[PDB]
Design an enzyme around this catalytic site. Structure first.
Site, PDB file in Angstrom:
ATOM      1  N   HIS A  43       0.829  -1.213   0.000  1.00 37.17           N
ATOM      2  CA  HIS A  43       0.000   0.000   0.000  1.00 37.17           C
ATOM      3  C   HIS A  43       0.863   1.263   0.000  1.00 37.17           C
ATOM      4  O   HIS A  43       2.080   1.226   0.209  1.00 37.17           O
ATOM      5  CB  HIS A  43      -1.028  -0.039   1.164  1.00 37.17           C
ATOM      6  CG  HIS A  43      -0.487   0.362   2.514  1.00 37.17           C
ATOM      7  ND1 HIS A  43      -1.180   1.176   3.391  1.00 37.17           N
ATOM      8  CD2 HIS A  43       0.683   0.060   3.135  1.00 37.17           C
ATOM      9  CE1 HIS A  43      -0.471   1.343   4.496  1.00 37.17           C
ATOM     10  NE2 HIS A  43       0.672   0.685   4.360  1.00 37.17           N
ATOM     11  N   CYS A  97       3.778   5.494   5.763  1.00 41.23           N
ATOM     12  CA  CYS A  97       3.883   4.289   6.575  1.00 41.23           C
ATOM     13  C   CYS A  97       5.337   3.820   6.635  1.00 41.23           C
ATOM     14  O   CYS A  97       6.127   4.079   5.718  1.00 41.23           O
ATOM     15  CB  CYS A  97       2.997   3.179   5.993  1.00 41.23           C
ATOM     16  SG  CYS A  97       2.987   1.597   6.846  1.00 41.23           S
ATOM     17  N   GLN A 115      -7.454  -3.128   9.802  1.00 41.10           N
ATOM     18  CA  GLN A 115      -8.611  -2.248   9.942  1.00 41.10           C
ATOM     19  C   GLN A 115      -9.651  -2.639   8.904  1.00 41.10           C
ATOM     20  O   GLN A 115      -9.316  -2.963   7.758  1.00 41.10           O
ATOM     21  CB  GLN A 115      -8.199  -0.788   9.765  1.00 41.10           C
ATOM     22  CG  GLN A 115      -7.168  -0.318  10.765  1.00 41.10           C
ATOM     23  CD  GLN A 115      -6.930   1.173  10.726  1.00 41.10           C
ATOM     24  OE1 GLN A 115      -7.808   1.975  11.032  1.00 41.10           O
ATOM     25  NE2 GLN A 115      -5.761   1.553  10.253  1.00 41.10           N
ATOM     26  N   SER A 138      -6.239   5.509   9.895  1.00 50.64           N
ATOM     27  CA  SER A 138      -4.862   5.968   9.698  1.00 50.64           C
ATOM     28  C   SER A 138      -4.759   7.087   8.675  1.00 50.64           C
ATOM     29  O   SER A 138      -3.792   7.863   8.720  1.00 50.64           O
ATOM     30  CB  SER A 138      -3.930   4.836   9.237  1.00 50.64           C
ATOM     31  OG  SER A 138      -4.257   3.597   9.818  1.00 50.64           O
ATOM     32  N   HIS A 141      -5.570   5.299   1.688  1.00 46.89           N
ATOM     33  CA  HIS A 141      -4.717   4.252   1.105  1.00 46.89           C
ATOM     34  C   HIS A 141      -4.958   4.054  -0.398  1.00 46.89           C
ATOM     35  O   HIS A 141      -6.077   4.259  -0.906  1.00 46.89           O
ATOM     36  CB  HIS A 141      -4.970   2.893   1.804  1.00 46.89           C
ATOM     37  CG  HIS A 141      -4.919   2.897   3.309  1.00 46.89           C
ATOM     38  ND1 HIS A 141      -3.772   2.551   4.012  1.00 46.89           N
ATOM     39  CD2 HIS A 141      -5.842   3.229   4.243  1.00 46.89           C
ATOM     40  CE1 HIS A 141      -4.014   2.617   5.310  1.00 46.89           C
ATOM     41  NE2 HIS A 141      -5.257   3.048   5.478  1.00 46.89           N
TER      42      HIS A 141
HETATM   43  C1  LIG Z   1      -3.437  -2.847  11.479  1.00 42.02           C
HETATM   44  N1  LIG Z   1      -2.886  -2.413  10.207  1.00 42.02           N
HETATM   45  C2  LIG Z   1      -1.466  -2.536   9.878  1.00 42.02           C
HETATM   46  C3  LIG Z   1      -1.359  -1.880   8.507  1.00 42.02           C
HETATM   47  N2  LIG Z   1      -2.752  -1.616   8.153  1.00 42.02           N
HETATM   48  C4  LIG Z   1      -3.148  -1.106   6.852  1.00 42.02           C
HETATM   49  C5  LIG Z   1      -3.613  -1.869   9.182  1.00 42.02           C
HETATM   50  O1  LIG Z   1      -4.823  -1.654   9.182  1.00 42.02           O
END
Ligand SMILES: CN1CCN(C)C1=O
Ligand SMILES: [Cl-]
Length: 147
Positions: A43, A97, A115, A138, A141
């Site tokens: 990603h 990241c 997630q 986060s 993406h």
């Molecule tokens: C928990 N993680 C690790 C990387 N990512 C995209 C997650 O959602």
């Protein structure tokens, strides 16, 4: 009719039909082709000021708005699709990241570990396919399924 998540749509600027997937946010002109325990994905992540942790190896304090993060994501998708740039090159240079140092590779995983929007998008992609913008706590993406 069509594989999991796809629907028909009409282009506003040309009038020609296209296909859109509401789980991965992918879109394409061609009719989509034709579940495993684990998949492997890479990603590219762009964070923003409402991210769960607004910081990264590129920037101690991340200040860009969410709307600005989406515009950056949209521009990277354009350059990958035209072939001007590779998905692995942009992720090494611009992903917020820690996996940037591995060209975006996250390894293989099962249902339950990531997630939930990321998980649903990863498992609906076919091998070799790329997503559109996918939103989590986060950030935003772009997902590439390698296995
Ligand atoms: C928990 N993680 C690790 C990387 N990512 C995209 C997650 O959602
Ligand atoms: Cl497949």
């Amino acid at each position: 009719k069509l594989p999991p998540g796809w629907e028909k749509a009409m282009s506003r600027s040309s009038g020609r039909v296209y296909y859109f997937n509401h789980i991965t946010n992918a879109s394409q002109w061609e009719r989509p082709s034709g579940e495993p325990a684990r998949v492997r994905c890479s990603h590219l992540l762009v964070k923003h000021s409402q991210s769960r942790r607004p910081s990264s190896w590129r920037q101690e304090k991340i200040t860009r708005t969410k709307e600005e993060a989406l515009e950056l994501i949209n521009g990277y998708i354009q350059k990958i699709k035209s072939g001007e740039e590779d998905f692995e090159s942009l992720a090494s240079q611009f992903s917020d990241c820690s996996s940037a140092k591995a060209r975006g590779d996250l390894g293989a995983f099962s249902r339950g570990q990531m997630q939930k929007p990321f998980e649903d998008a990863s498992f609906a992609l076919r091998t070799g396919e790329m997503s559109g913008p996918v939103f989590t706590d986060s950030g935003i993406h772009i997902i590439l399924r390698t296995e």
